[PDB]
Design a protein around this nucleic acid. Structure first.
Lengths: 206, 396, 432, 235
RNA sequence: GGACAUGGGUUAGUCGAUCCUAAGAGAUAGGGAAGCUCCGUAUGAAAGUUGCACGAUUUUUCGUGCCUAUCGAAAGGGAAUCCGGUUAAUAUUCCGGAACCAGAAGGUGGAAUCACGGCAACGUAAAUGAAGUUGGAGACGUCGGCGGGAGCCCUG
RNA sequence: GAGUUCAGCGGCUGAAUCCGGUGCGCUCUCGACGGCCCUUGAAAAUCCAACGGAAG
RNA sequence: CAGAAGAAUCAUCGAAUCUUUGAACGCACUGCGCCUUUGGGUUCUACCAAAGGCAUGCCUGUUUGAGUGUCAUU
């Protein structure tokens, strides 16, 4: 078998990130929110999607016609997105729930967010894929989402989601996110490495 | 024209239009039409404009050219086995026949009597060309006997004696034996010279000495070929100038003994050659073959056969051309004999006119063998046909 | 010069295989077939298949390379690719949970017009009129079939409209000539602009799809024929001066008026002209209305067969009352009761038929197919031996290719059919 | 010009072999997709639905023994649009009586008090309206199936109708149509002979094929004359 | 005068080149180097000019199976032409006559219904052969003697 | 019928252009051997055939 | 010199033509190819000609894909 170079790079990077010792700030992203709660998170998030580019123009031209003939509204409620915008919201202590993508490509973009969210007192969760967050906000990718205000109808729903994240993500893991990650080896890998280690330690010290 | 109540054929008949069901196959036929439209290859032709195929045949005009060997009227019986070969005397009154039984029967053509019942397997038998020397050479296995029956005039026996009086030579109810010639192989076919001084013997088993030439004047035998290639099926002599014709398994070879050289090799293009016959003019040859084919060769046309004829349902056994009348016959194991008319014109422009004349039938077939040999009458269009059941049919 | 490489020209260069045609067009089989349906393309077998197949012998279908090269520059092919792009954008829209953007994508779905396909396939209107019968056969077949998940409801609606418009034209122009009844359905034969049109209409019954026919193929043929019929009907209505398309009466269609819903407002053809036929509730109105109005006869029908009936049951103006039911309790007078075969026999023969012989409960005269022509010797329902054999066994004896062998089928089949139907009259006379 | 349509280049042998292996795959998959898991929410969702039905049935029966019973018509068309797992037994029987034992089943009913109260009991599961002459004709002419000896047989010919219904003077499809649309004396017998129709929603659009829980937007309740459009989208 | 001036003169389907490869060279992949550039030639390349075939069209959005550079030889390898005549100068080229090779389709005649014969070596006018798998020619050192033929020489 | 050589005539017309014998002869090529090899003696283009049994 | 009779070996110059090469770009250095379309001739599945095309690196976009890369999907 002869894999292409880019396919070989992909799979080696997968194994390499496992064998190495991942620091606690980077290993906490290996432990994401469970599948049930993530579904409930995105149910609430999909009631606050920002309006589409067509739907916004549809609304604006509707109001433009009214003034063109002859002529006050409510504050829009939606989900907050954008790394700089969300980080500014967390430092402002305005965010109620921060949802960090688990595979942001340069990981240091989000590596401080769990600590910043815990410093400011914001309930946060790490959810799977940057594309699920992107889907909510009509983008291809969202490194992080945040909820600051919801309608009075969904105040009780958000209070249930926040408790579930607290019970299933923060109360859980917790100590597991303070431990260096990695070093995971296959079923037969330690035995092979033990033979290699004892052979090397015998006389192969140069 | 198929409907509820059509008289054309009786699909189904319906007493009324209301009772008529819905054709459940209609979608299938329409679907097949769709598939035919864009999947069935379309070939363009000349639409074969209205032209009955009866215009293809030419005019043979048999009503003019009709020397008809009509239906047989004389049946000769008494032979208990297959009549392997039969021959007619130059005078045309005597017909000598023989077969595997070893019984030689001489029949009088006009009366049908078997006057000479003396038996004396029979490979073949041929009369001498000389009327005053009616010597019949009969082949039995590897031995050929020059028999002069006493039925002829007494002086003719003496006339035949002085003709002779490799192969070894030796000199009974009228068993007048004159010369017995023995050969290493079992001779298949016999041929006689025009003057009667030469006898040609052909055997298929042998390769080096398949064919032997016997000269009665010196009373000896020899092999005409220094090196013979291929099996030999039959041999004959040219009836006009001295050429020797060898009918091999595949080819027909013409050899001039005067120069001891090859003349022409006719390619029959046939898996197996059965027998050959020569027109009296000598420039036309008729070849019977085991491939159920008759090949007409014109020596002045080409080495390839002039025409090919493939009507016989079984292997063509024997072919014979009438010495005087422009007719010839072909007998096969199918039990049917094809009688054709071949008119030969000495003019260069006029190609030979070969047309069928009759298809004789009603001959018994035994052990996949029907007609074995056919002979032409020296005077008129009369045919002697030998069957596997011992029946000799005289087709007048 | 150079040594010419074997098989670099001739049949090997003129003919192309199906697989090589696929890779040349960069098409898939489903799309290559679909463009072959719309265009006029078909397999062509060469005289020397082995030579055309580069010396191979596997059974392989062949196409003209010039036919394939003509498909390289087809604007429809780019419409097949645009549909693939749109289908993927629709998938992404729904998979991302954007219902409204999916609706917008569906509205701007790429559609293509078959204008240039018809022009390049049929240059002149008479060429279209020649191969219009196959289209009419299919549109009528599918105008009565139930809607499937394969073939849409819009396609069925268009087939009914196009079929009804064509029937309206034939009735208006009296171009119908013959109408024949068979077990398959009703064979109609009309003449338009000199050309002859023959199609088949099945009986309306609750059939079942055979489930063995590929309805994807039916989809492209329906699409091609509907475009072909639309432009043909447009010209025919312009020729008559009628505005195209005729308006559709929604209320009449909602009441199943049939042809009566479409009103053709302007922008022996009189065999039944002086007659007012009536239709009972046991007869194929979809067929009887067509023929009678085409030949001038006025039509009234039972209310349950469709609204818009100009006549009632009790109207005494009825000349004939077609009714296939063997029992009529409320028998009228002056409205002589006949069977449906009476009308169609009259159409085929161009003359009025025997109402007494076709009266209710009577025997039914045999049906004559007008399409069947009288043969050389076929039965219409309404000393020598020696010369003969010699003249018959010489071509099979001497002729080179024995092309005379065709008699073994031309004369044999005709004689066997002639002998059968000639002896049939002897059998039926003996039975009588 | 002599163009001949030779035999097709389809290779019918391998074609039907490919047909059989594809069928064998379908049976393989059908026997493979077994015993899907059920999450806790689906069980509660059923209970809330069952309690929703129980309240509805009590309110419709208690103190509400009335029906608006549409008028100016005698024939109604009833289509079972939706079904719930573990129906209450009262709903199960009424659907059985109305011959709607399977989803998308459609049945003609004589508009009267008896059918109206049954329809009110089973209202959330059936969509019903007033068929017209056009709807009745094409439904029978294209999807009519009869009860011949107790198996589902298509009404392809009038001979079977005459054989099985000759005692009531029913000989033809058109006679069946007239009886159904007029509700004659033998209307009950004709409906007994007729199988319920199967008007499954049609998914022709690519959007229809992809969206989930597609039922053509089939609403419940008395749709009046709109059922003609729904049938038109079907037949 | 091989000078100068003015004109003329080299004709090819078969002769050479053109095609193939040789030792080697050489771009491409990648890697060096501040750099002009160098190393590298199936190298950790997604290395296929329409690689090939299959399919009643497959939820009318393609599925299944198989196999996996170029330059460098006018002396090496290689489809095919001879004779007579002809010019001031050109001839296997031109003229006259006579052949040959390669490729291309149909047509005509013949042949088999996937042909026969011979113990055999093998023969014949023909006598289908996909994928896949092999075999042969090309294609192979040098020396000596013998045999055969041709031409030339000798001579009646 | 070409070519050559002789005769002529005024391009044309005549004739001949034949039969041998041969040699460690020279030149070229082919066949059948016998050695010496050693390092057992280019590659590819191209052409043909076999096994195989898909299909009709 | 001959010959011709808006001339001109004129000026100006905003429209065109611009052979083979050369950064030189289909491949080579006399040649050898491929792709699309059109056309011809005693003449058509053959041959020929013409026109327009085919270099490399990179950028934006488009379409088509690959991945035991990251996931979602009762």
């Amino acid at each position: 078998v002869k894999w292409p170079e880019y396919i070989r790079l992909q799979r080696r990077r997968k194994i390499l990130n496992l064998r190495l010792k991942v620091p606690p700030a980077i290993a906490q992203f290996q432990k994401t929110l469970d599948k049930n709660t993530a579904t409930q998170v995105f149910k609430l998030l999909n009631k606050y999607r920002p309006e589409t580019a067509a739907e916004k123009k549809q609304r604006l031209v509707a109001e433009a016609e009214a003034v063109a003939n002859g002529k006050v509204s409510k504050k829009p409620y939606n989900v907050k997105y954008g790394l700089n915008h969300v980080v500014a919201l967390i430092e402002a202590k305005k965010a109620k729930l921060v949802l960090i993508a688990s595979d942001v490509d340069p990981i240091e973009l989000v590596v401080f967010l769990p600590a910043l969210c815990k410093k400011m007192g914001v309930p946060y969760a790490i959810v799977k894929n940057k594309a699920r967050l992107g889907t909510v906000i009509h983008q291809k990718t969202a490194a992080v989402l945040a909820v600051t205000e919801v309608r009075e109808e969904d105040k009780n729903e958000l209070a249930s989601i926040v408790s579930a994240v607290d019970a299933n993500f923060s109360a859980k893991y917790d100590e597991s996110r303070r431990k260096w990650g990695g070093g995971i080896m296959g079923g037969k890998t330690q035995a092979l490495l033990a033979k290699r280690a004892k052979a090397a330690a015998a006389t192969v010290r140069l | 024209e198929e409907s509820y109540n059509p008289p054309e054929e009786y699909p189904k008949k319906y007493k009324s239009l209301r009772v008529v069901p819905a054709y459940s196959n209609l979608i299938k036929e329409k679907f097949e039409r769709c598939l035919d439209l864009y999947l069935a290859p379309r070939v363009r032709r000349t639409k074969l404009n209205i032209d009955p195929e009866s215009l293809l045949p030419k005019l043979p005009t048999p009503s003019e050219l009709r020397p008809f060997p009509t239906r047989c009227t004389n049946v000769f019986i008494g032979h208990k086995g297959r009549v392997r070969c039969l021959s007619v005397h130059v005078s045309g009154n005597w017909l000598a026949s023989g077969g595997d039984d070893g019984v030689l029967r001489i029949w009088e053509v006009m009366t049908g009597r078997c006057v000479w019942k003396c038996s004396l397997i029979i490979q073949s038998l041929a009369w001498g060309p000389l009327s005053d020397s009616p010597v019949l050479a009969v082949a039995v296995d590897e031995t050929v006997y020059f028999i002069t029956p006493p039925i002829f005039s007494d002086e003719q026996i003496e006339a035949s004696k002085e003709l002779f009086t490799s192969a070894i030579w030796r000199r009974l109810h009228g068993g007048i034996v004159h010369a017995t010639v023995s050969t290493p192989s079992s001779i298949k076919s016999l041929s006689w010279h025009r003057r009667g001084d030469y006898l040609a013997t052909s055997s298929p088993t042998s390769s080096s000495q398949a064919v032997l030439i016997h000269q009665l004047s010196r009373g000896a035998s020899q092999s005409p070929f220094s090196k013979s290639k291929g099996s030999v099926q039959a041999v004959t002599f040219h009836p006009t100038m001295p050429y020797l014709l060898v009918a091999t398994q595949r080819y027909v070879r013409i050899y001039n003994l005067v120069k001891q050289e090859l003349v022409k090799t006719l390619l029959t293009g046939v898996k197996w050659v059965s027998s050959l016959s020569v027109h009296s003019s000598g420039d036309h040859v008729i070849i019977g073959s085991y491939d159920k084919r008759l090949c007409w060769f014109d020596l002045d046309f080409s080495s390839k056969p002039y025409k090919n004829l493939r009507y016989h349902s079984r292997a063509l056994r024997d072919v014979s051309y009438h010495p005087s009348l422009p007719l010839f016959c072909s007998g096969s194991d199918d039990g049917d004999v094809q009688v054709f008319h071949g008119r030969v014109y000495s003019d260069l422009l006029a190609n030979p006119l070969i047309v069928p004349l009759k298809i004789l039938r009603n001959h018994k077939v035994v052990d996949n063998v029907g007609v074995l040999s056919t002979c032409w009458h020296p005077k008129e269009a009369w045919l002697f046909s030998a069957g596997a059941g011992g029946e000799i049919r005289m087709w007048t | 010069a150079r040594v010419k490489q074997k098989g670099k020209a001739g049949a090997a260069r003129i003919y192309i295989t199906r697989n090589q045609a696929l890779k040349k067009l960069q098409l898939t089989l489903a799309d290559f077939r679909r463009i072959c349906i719309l265009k006029g393309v078909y397999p062509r077998e060469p005289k020397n298949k082995k030579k055309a197949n580069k010396g191979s012998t596997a059974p392989v279908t062949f196409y003209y390379t010039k036919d394939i090269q003509y498909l390289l520059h087809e604007p429809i092919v780019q419409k097949f690719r645009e549909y693939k792009v749109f289908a993927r954008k629709l998938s992404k829209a729904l998979g991302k949970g954007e219902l409204e953007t999916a609706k917008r994508l569906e509205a701007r779905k790429p559609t293509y017009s078959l204008d240039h396909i018809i022009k390049e396939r049929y240059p002149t209107f008479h060429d279209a009129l020649k191969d219009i019968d196959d289209a009419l056969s299919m549109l009528f077949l599918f105008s009565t079939m139930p809607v499937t998940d394969k073939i849409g409801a819009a396609t069925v609606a268009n087939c009914e409209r196009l079929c009804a418009e064509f029937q309206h034209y034939v009735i208006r122009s009296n171009s119908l000539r013959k109408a024949f009844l068979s077990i398959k359905g009703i064979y109609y034969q009309a003449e338009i602009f000199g050309e002859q049109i023959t199609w088949i209409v099945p009986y309306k019954f609750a059939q079942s799809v055979p489930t063995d026919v590929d309805f994807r193929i039916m989809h492209t043929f329906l699409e091609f024929y509907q475009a072909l019929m639309g432009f043909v009907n447009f010209k025919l209505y312009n020729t008559l001066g009628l505005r195209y398309p005729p308006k559709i009466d929604v209320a009449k269609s909602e009441s199943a008026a049939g042809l009566a819903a479409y009103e053709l407002e302007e922008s022996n053809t009189s065999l039944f002209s002086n007659f007012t036929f009536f239709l009972s509730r046991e007869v194929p109105r979809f067929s009887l209305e067509f023929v009678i109005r085409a030949f001038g006869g006025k039509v009234g029908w039972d209310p349950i067969l469709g609204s818009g009936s100009p006549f009632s049951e009790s109207d005494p103006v009825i000349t004939h009352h077609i009714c296939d039911r063997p029992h009529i309790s409320q028998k009228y007078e002056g409205r002589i009761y006949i069977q449906p075969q009476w009308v169609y026999d009259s159409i085929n023969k161009g003359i009025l038929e025997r109402t007494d012989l076709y009266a209710c409960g009577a025997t039914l005269p045999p049906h004559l197919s007008p399409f069947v022509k009288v043969g050389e010797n076929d039965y219409d329902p309404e000393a020598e031996e020696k010369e003969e054999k010699e003249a018959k066994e010489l071509s099979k004896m001497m002729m080179s290719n024995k092309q005379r062998k065709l008699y073994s089928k031309l004369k044999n089949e005709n004689s066997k059919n002639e002998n059968y139907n000639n002896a049939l009259r002897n059998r039926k006379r003996d039975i009588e | 010009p002599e163009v001949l349509l030779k035999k097709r280049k389809v290779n019918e042998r391998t074609r039907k072999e490919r047909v059989e292996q594809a069928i064998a795959k379908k049976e393989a998959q059908k026997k493979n997709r077994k015993e899907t898991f059920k999450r806790a929410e689906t069980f509660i969702n059923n209970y809330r639905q069952r309690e929703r039905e129980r309240i509805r049935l009590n309110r419709s029966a208690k103190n509400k023994g009335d029906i608006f019973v549409p008028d100016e018509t005698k024939l109604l068309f009833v289509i079972r649009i939706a079904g719930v797992k573990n129906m209450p037994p009262k709903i199960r029987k009424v659907l059985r009586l109305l011959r709607l034992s399977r989803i998308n089943n459609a049945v003609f009913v004589r508009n009267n008090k008896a059918v109206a109260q049954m329809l009110r009991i089973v209202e959330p599961y059936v969509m019903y309206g007033i068929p017209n002459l056009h709807s009745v004709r094409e439904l029978i002419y294209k999807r009519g199936f009869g009860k011949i000896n107790g198996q589902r047989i298509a009404l392809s010919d009038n001979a079977l109708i005459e054989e099985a219904l000759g005692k009531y003077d029913v000989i033809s499809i058109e006679d069946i149509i007239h009886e159904i649309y007029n509700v004659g004396s033998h209307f009950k017998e004709v409906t007994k002979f007729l199988w319920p129709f199967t008007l499954t929603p049609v998914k022709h659009s690519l959007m229809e094929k992809k969206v989930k829980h597609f039922n053509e937007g089939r609403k419940a309740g008395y749709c009046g004359e709109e059922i003609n459009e729904l049938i038109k989208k079907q037949v």
